[PDB]
Amino acid sequence: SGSGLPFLVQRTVAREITLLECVGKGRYGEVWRGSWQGENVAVKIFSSRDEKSWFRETELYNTVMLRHENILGFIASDMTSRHSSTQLWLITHYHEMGSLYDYLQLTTLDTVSCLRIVLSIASGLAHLHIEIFGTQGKPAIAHRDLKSKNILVKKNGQCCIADLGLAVMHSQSTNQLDVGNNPRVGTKRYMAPEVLDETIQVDCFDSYKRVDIWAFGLVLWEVARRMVSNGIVEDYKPPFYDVVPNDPSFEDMRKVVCVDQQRPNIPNRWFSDPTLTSLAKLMKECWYQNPSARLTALRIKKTLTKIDNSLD
Template sequence: MLLLPGQNEMLDVCGGRDFLSDRRASEGYIVVVKSSCCYCSGEELRAGPRRLLRVHVFHFILKCFHGIKDDVYRQDPRRKEHVCHLADFCTRLVHRQECVATEESPQVFFCCCEGNYCNEKFTHLPEAVPPAVKIQPPQPGPSLLGVLVYSLLPFGILCLALVLGCWTYHQRKPPYRHVDIGQGAGLPPPSPLVGLKPLQLLELKARGRFGCVWKAQLLSEYVAVKIFPIQDKQSWQNERDIYLTEGFKHENILHYISAEKRGTNLQMELWLVTEFHERGSLTDYLKGNPLSWPQLCHISASMSRGLAYLHEDLPYRAEGPKPAIAHRDFKSKNVLLKMDLTAVIADFGLAVCFEPGKPPGDTHGQVGTWRYMAPEVLEGAINFQRDAFLRIDMYALGLVLWELVSRCTASDGPVGEYQLPFEEEVGQHPSLEDLQDVVVHKKMRPVFKDCWIKHPGLGQLCETIEECWDHDAEARLSAGCVEERISTISKTTNTINTSTSECLVSMMTSDSDTDLPPKESST
């Protein structure tokens, strides 16, 4: 169709010819395309009241196009511009008879169609766009401190509750009641004295390898309570069995009262109740007190007497036979002193009993305190016979006697501070290797001072000590022999001292009689 200037009708020329020739630039045209006629508009003409369009001819246009500028269309929707473009611009839309704009750019609405004058009418139909999904920003994760607080807070509350529960339980539970062990057949019941009233622990006196010792009160008497933890049950049971050995009773052996179990389950403790001695151990006494010669003799004799009784095999006695017993941990710490300085032997946790016809108990060789171990024990060359174990005790007795001599005031020399055996050579905390080197390889022993040897009593006692700690175990004295020697030395020395004193008194009297002038008469 052809629109001429100043005319209203359109001349249908589509399909008659391939295309129109170029005309004047000021005239409006209908572009005739080979297969379609499209409506196009050019620049506005101002000649006359009607607007004429300048139409340009584009060759080879196969599709029609309609474009609207966004700013023009929004101000006046009736104002439109029809623009023609080459066909390759609209190749993506085919087989559409209406010019419908479904896409838009920020400034242009456009559509493509095919068919005569299909682009004259323009429709804007935006494609359905799915609603925008609002992406929430990721929530910040919990901080490490917060995680730790929330994780540990319940655990802390639980621990606090357990502590409070245990404290409340201990505060409210009744005092220990006596419980008889009764695990073995033939075990005699505990002393009836113990069951009359609960024990009251008063003061912690000492701690040892297998437990601690408390001063306690039972009725109106003081007693000693040795408390073993449950893991040291073997030591507690062994000591209890030694005390319960038939006929095992002597004035120089610690008096046994009872063995008891206190508490239950994990809180169970094993108690051993014995008589209490206020002076404590020989070690503690020697640290703070020097000894006179009579005190030295009394302690030495009673200590040797107790060890001799322990070693003796007494098959024929009215109170029953007593087998030989080796202490195996004899030292000054395990010797207690009564108020009159009489010695009593204690702590039988490692002791072994040699009953005729029965094998001994645990005879593991290297037991006891390293400082007091005999050379054969240190080098692990023990003959597991009764006499061999008794001789090991005698070596230790020699060291304890040396401790007594070192604190005696009988000699002319000064009395030094208390020292343990070999403390000068290996210090207070020697290793097993240190003692092996000093005692076994170098065959060293604690030193005797010259002033001790010059004293008549101390000199003889030093000779006895040397025979107790002889390197050859079979050459050592027995406990009974040591007891006799000390008794003899004590008597002899007392006689010498008495004779010396009488001579001194006689000399002083004679000098007085000679030097004093005779009494003058009154005349």
């Protein structure tokens, strides 16, 4: 049932996996490359600081049909008791090119590759946001911690969205909102204005969708900077690099985004390129302070597909 293996089979696969090498370690826990029967899988071990995200992500992938080529493929989840301690495991497909964050730092893009990246992200986010009826379907889902580190680059040049630990869900069946309980907040650098100034409507599901659109505009910016046009390209930078420190505070960000009304600068060279011009316009329409004026994920998907079809 759900998105991955049957529940007893999930226990079996998890116990048989060997961890080969660690590819990420932090306050959150660890990500490892591992192997089941000579096939690479990704194994996340959650730290005790972020156990509630394991529960939320596991409950989601197992009670909902979430299969899409732009959402990280869930395989299994398990609880173990290694030695004088317990461990929470999430297993997914392994993507060897790694996060978009790492990928953007090591390579530049052409028009096709830039668009394949941003279009695949849009498809994944629209698929999350949109409800599917019937017993096959899914509730509407908002992510709440979208950023370049939570997007992986697959081998084919497309990406997938990862980390549903902060997800909220909605159905039109009840008009009911499932927020769960997780003290974790989004990455401060990607927090929308309504979150930073605590005006966000927390009983309205649309609010969370619009927070994702804010954060998606910022990722659009990160990617576009790396598309070459006329021999010119920018260095990789994170959103708001020039006005906040590494690991910025809540107050730092509120000052930048709400008080000073700052938004990512649009390089002027983008205006000589038709694709970058169009992406700059999209970005703007993700960055309105008024959450209700922002574009939807589906609209962004359709707009990127139109831009994709104008490529000669």
